[PDB]
Ligand binder design. Structure first.
Ligand SMILES: [Cl-]
Length: 146
């Protein structure tokens, strides 16, 4: 089957209240955690090393782990997950570039070494998160890989 499996009650936005709720996502097969979402200002498709930009997603001690929001395009989803993992992300969310069913997004080497949770999300949810972040809101999220 597909390497990303659609799940109905596995992603919960916990803050801000404007977008709080439960949303569908497609969880990667390779691969509960609460994290804070960041949308990088560069290399937004995660097809090149974040270290070339001097960008790190490792959280400070005592702070929420960082979930990186990544745009679909230009490279395979597994490479995006590997690259965010090397940058210290605790998980990755890849937002679709088109408005369409999630199951359509996952179309037909280091894959055995990906260890962070990975999920695909819709364009609508990606845009909502980006809007919340752009306004100054912290976006917190709970992933459940059950
Ligand atoms: Cl695989």
């Amino acid at each position: 089957g597909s390497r990303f499996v659609v799940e109905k009650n596995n992603l919960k936005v916990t803050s801000p209240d404007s977008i709080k709720g439960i949303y569908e996502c497609a969880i990667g097969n390779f691969g509960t955690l609460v994290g804070t979402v960041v949308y990088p200002k560069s290399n937004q498709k995660a097809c090149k090393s974040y270290s070339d930009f001097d960008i790190s997603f490792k959280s400070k001690p005592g702070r929420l782990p960082t979930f990186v929001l990544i745009d679909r395009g230009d490279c395979y989803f597994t490479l995006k997950a590997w690259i965010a993992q090397q940058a210290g992300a605790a998980a990755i969310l890849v937002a679709d570039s088109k408005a369409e069913p999630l199951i359509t997004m996952d179309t037909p080497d280091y894959l055995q070494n990906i260890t962070i949770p990975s999920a695909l999300i819709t364009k609508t949810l990606g845009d909502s998160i980006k809007s919340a972040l752009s306004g100054g809101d912290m976006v917190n999220m709970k992933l459940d890989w059950t």
